[PDB]
Amino acid sequence: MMTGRQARAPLQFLPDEARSLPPPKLTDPRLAYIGFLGYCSGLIDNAIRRRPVLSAGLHRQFLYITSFVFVGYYLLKRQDYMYAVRDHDMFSYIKSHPEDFPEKDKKTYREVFEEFHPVR
């Protein structure tokens, strides 16, 4: 539904507006979770090929962790870029059309009528 925004300039993973956003820190919990996913994948390779699970192939585990962290960082960058685009289009349309979305006067509780149902 954002395809119109991805209409003029296609097949761009991170457009020029994505560089103006704060990138995710390396201590982000999502990045740590994806690194844990890569570590679990390395453990599964140590398990299914009948190898020792916690010592065999440290290079394979490090490669899995690095690849998972790399693709997770780029996917998180794309995710927060898209969510920022969503909120910016939101606020642009809500500045653009005030006739179809008016204001509400929040009444106090001293005059709004409510019906009380007794529990007994």
């Binding site: 929040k106 106090t108 509780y109 001293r110 409510e114 009380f116």
Partner: protein, 171 residues
């Protein structure tokens, strides 16, 4: 100790023990034995603990909450101030519950201490208890286990419309 207004008790009137017959009673001898063997070491260990108390005497204070705007001046679906209004309402709910508890304590103490003729001398306590029970029943009853200040305000509103309708239909 305790404040004497919140727990009022009448002064004690004990009649004079004057023997009619010549046979002595063991109650005085056992009272003297109690005062000698029992009361003196209890008072000694009490003066010990209070003397140890007197060296380190620090204070604790009763917490007090300032008055906050109530649920009537809350904008609807704006939680940032009806939260405080509900907080104050729950604190007042606990205070009112303890008030009815202390009135019940007063009534029980009167009925026990007035002996076999308590039906006449505890009329004031019965009137106070009936008034506070009617106040609590008007203020908090039938709210349900999910009570909130909005439900209490709606019940108060319905009671006010009922009273105004009764006034208008009997004016």
């Amino acid at each position: 100790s305790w404040d004497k207004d919140v727990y009022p008790e009448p002064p004690r009137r004990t009649p004079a023990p004057s023997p009619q017959t010549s046979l002595p009673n063991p109650i005085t001898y056992l009272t003297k034995a109690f005062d000698l063997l029992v009361d003196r070491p209890v008072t000694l260990v009490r003066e010990f603990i209070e003397r140890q108390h007197a060296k380190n005497k620090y204070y604790y204070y009763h917490r007090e909450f300032r008055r906050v705007p109530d649920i009537t001046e809350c904008h609807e679906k704006d939680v940032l101030c009806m939260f405080e209004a509900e907080m104050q309402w729950k604190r007042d709910y606990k205070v009112d519950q303890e008030i009815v508890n202390i009135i019940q304590e007063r009534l029980k103490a009167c009925q026990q201490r007035e002996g076999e003729s308590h039906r006449q001398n505890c009329a004031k306590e019965l009137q106070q208890f009936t008034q506070v029970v009617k106040a609590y029943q008007d203020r908090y009853h039938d709210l349900g286990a999910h009570y909130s200040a909005r439900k209490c305000l709606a019940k108060q509103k319905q009671r006010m419309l009922a009273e105004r309708k009764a006034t208008k239909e009997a004016a």
